[PDB]
Design an enzyme around this catalytic site. Structure first.
Site, PDB file in Angstrom:
ATOM      1  N   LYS A   1      40.202  45.543  35.763  1.00 47.48           N
ATOM      2  CA  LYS A   1      41.549  45.833  36.297  1.00 47.48           C
ATOM      3  C   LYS A   1      42.557  44.861  35.638  1.00 47.48           C
ATOM      4  O   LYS A   1      42.342  43.677  35.644  1.00 47.48           O
ATOM      5  CB  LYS A   1      41.630  45.637  37.808  1.00 47.48           C
ATOM      6  CG  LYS A   1      43.026  45.921  38.389  1.00 47.48           C
ATOM      7  CD  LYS A   1      43.399  47.354  38.155  1.00 47.48           C
ATOM      8  CE  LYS A   1      44.869  47.675  38.419  1.00 47.48           C
ATOM      9  NZ  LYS A   1      45.682  47.467  37.217  1.00 47.48           N
ATOM     10  N   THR A   2      43.608  45.436  35.062  1.00 47.35           N
ATOM     11  CA  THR A   2      44.602  44.721  34.263  1.00 47.35           C
ATOM     12  C   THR A   2      45.816  44.347  35.153  1.00 47.35           C
ATOM     13  O   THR A   2      45.971  44.835  36.280  1.00 47.35           O
ATOM     14  CB  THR A   2      45.127  45.610  33.096  1.00 47.35           C
ATOM     15  OG1 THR A   2      45.710  46.808  33.621  1.00 47.35           O
ATOM     16  CG2 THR A   2      44.010  46.042  32.179  1.00 47.35           C
ATOM     17  N   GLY A   3      46.629  43.415  34.629  1.00 45.26           N
ATOM     18  CA  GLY A   3      47.954  43.157  35.206  1.00 45.26           C
ATOM     19  C   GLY A   3      48.860  42.543  34.184  1.00 45.26           C
ATOM     20  O   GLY A   3      48.405  41.962  33.234  1.00 45.26           O
TER      21      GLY A   3
ATOM     22  N   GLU B   1      57.602  43.507  43.121  1.00 46.24           N
ATOM     23  CA  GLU B   1      58.124  42.131  43.316  1.00 46.24           C
ATOM     24  C   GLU B   1      57.118  41.028  43.231  1.00 46.24           C
ATOM     25  O   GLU B   1      57.462  39.934  42.858  1.00 46.24           O
ATOM     26  CB  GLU B   1      58.800  41.988  44.664  1.00 46.24           C
ATOM     27  CG  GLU B   1      60.097  42.726  44.683  1.00 46.24           C
ATOM     28  CD  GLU B   1      60.081  43.929  45.594  1.00 46.24           C
ATOM     29  OE1 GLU B   1      59.020  44.593  45.774  1.00 46.24           O
ATOM     30  OE2 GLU B   1      61.200  44.184  46.124  1.00 46.24           O
TER      31      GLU B   1
ATOM     32  N   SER C   1      48.797  42.895  38.822  1.00 49.43           N
ATOM     33  CA  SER C   1      48.096  44.058  39.374  1.00 49.43           C
ATOM     34  C   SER C   1      46.575  43.842  39.426  1.00 49.43           C
ATOM     35  O   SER C   1      45.884  44.731  39.910  1.00 49.43           O
ATOM     36  CB  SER C   1      48.392  45.347  38.584  1.00 49.43           C
ATOM     37  OG  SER C   1      49.733  45.836  38.877  1.00 49.43           O
TER      38      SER C   1
END
Lengths: 256, 256
Positions: free
Chosen positions: B201-203, B135, B39
């Site tokens: 911003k993380t993912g 996905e 993300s």
């Protein structure tokens, strides 16, 4: 009673008033008890500034000096040489709780006695502005200077943000600044579901005083206006943000 | 060296690139190693959206349905009946990592292929958008779809937020969204001293991929741009946020 339980758990006094603006149902616990308003007053101060200025007039640049800086100036300390517009000052004040930005705005509207005057005009006979920031945070129990009540703060915030003390385009500016507050993530925001929009302004003052005032928008239906105010009995007490978050949870259950 | 040690403590692979925009000094460790971007690609996507639209165009309302909702929809799930404007979608995607929001934004800019074209346009030949969310988080070792590198994510984030791929008013929107992210308190934020402003911003993705990209502002000095990326070798591996916090502390020291 769940508010009594919170007071017990946190060894604090709570002041709560909440108005569901679509039904007129209310949730109250010590709603008429005075507390130091602390930086919550910054929101009412911007409401008065917006009353007195066109949107365009907010572009006026204010010059200031290190003499205007006080204890906490996260934005204002950056712009001594360029100055800052009234719009930028309103931003800094509401979004960062920048105390010099509040002082600068209060000077532009005519000072604490003038703010008091304009609050009376919109119907608030309770809120007592007297000092500049951060001296207004020094309130002893029993004293009424720089205090207000949960009911009064709610009634005044509603007046500016949602009713007719401002025209819509100005209400929108206030709401936008407050929605995008940086200081309130652990307080009223922490007791509302994700996806419910929140506009808030926090406060901290002596005797462990910890406050948050807010407008909360459920995904549908009319918004709730809430004040959660708190204080403790030792002058240098610490506060616990979780008290306000948990109090908020109680209010939301009682209204929903 | 300290990054080696963290790889040993957390049984993981680290990608680090950091640029001090004031000195151009750099800190790197596997800086050109590919990782599933997860993300973090949300920040870049809003960059593209901002570039293609006026600020006023962000107020366009998007109608969506239950079929637009996927596995994690903290904000979008609440407003199916009212829709949300592009601006509110950008807020949801960046501050909550709302997966449906990202997809709805991606549709409006022309889909993953079109996002690829726009990134190449800004000078990014590395990042390979191919799928929608969730996905895109499914990347097996050795595959290059939906991957980038720490250097490329830093370069691209800087171009949008601090350089000239956007005008300042649009830079301000993206930066304020990222400053007010709710999902990164345990990652880069936790490796930076309190009070320094951080935009991030993380993912998280398969093989225990755990990422954070950020701009960090000393109280004074130009900002640092930073990407801390990580993956593990089992498909179902858990990650540990503390890897990202500790790596960040290393970067900060390396730069002081």
């Amino acid at each position: 009673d769940d508010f009594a339980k919170l007071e017990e758990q946190f060894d604090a006094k709570l002041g709560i008033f909440a108005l569901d603006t679509g039904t007129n149902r209310t949730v109250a616990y010590r709603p008429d008890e005075r507390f130091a308003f602390a930086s919550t007053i910054k929101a009412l101060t911007v409401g008065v500034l917006l009353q007195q200025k066109s949107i365009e007039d907010l572009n006026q640049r204010i010059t200031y000096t290190r003499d205007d800086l006080v204890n906490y100036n996260p934005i204002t300390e950056k712009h001594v040489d360029t100055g800052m517009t009234l719009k930028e000052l309103a931003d800094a004040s509401l979004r960062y709780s920048d105390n010099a930005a509040q002082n600068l705005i209060l000077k532009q509207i005519g000072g604490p006695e003038s703010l008091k005057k304009e609050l009376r005009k919109i119907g608030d006979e309770v809120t007592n502005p007297e000092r500049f920031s951060p001296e207004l945070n020094e309130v002893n129990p029993g004293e009424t200077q720089d205090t207000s009540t949960a009911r009064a703060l709610v009634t005044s915030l509603r007046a500016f943000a949602l009713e007719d003390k401002l025209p819509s385009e100005k209400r929108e500016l206030l709401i936008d600044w407050m929605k995008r507050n940086t200081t309130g993530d652990a307080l009223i925001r922490a007791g509302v579901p994700d996806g419910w929009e929140v506009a808030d302004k926090t406060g901290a003052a002596s005797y462990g005083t910890r406050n948050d005032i807010a407008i909360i928008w459920p995904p549908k239906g009319d918004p709730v206006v809430l004040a959660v105010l708190s204080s403790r009995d030792k002058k240098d007490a610490k506060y616990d943000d979780k008290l306000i978050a948990e109090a908020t949870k109680v209010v939301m259950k009682a209204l929903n």
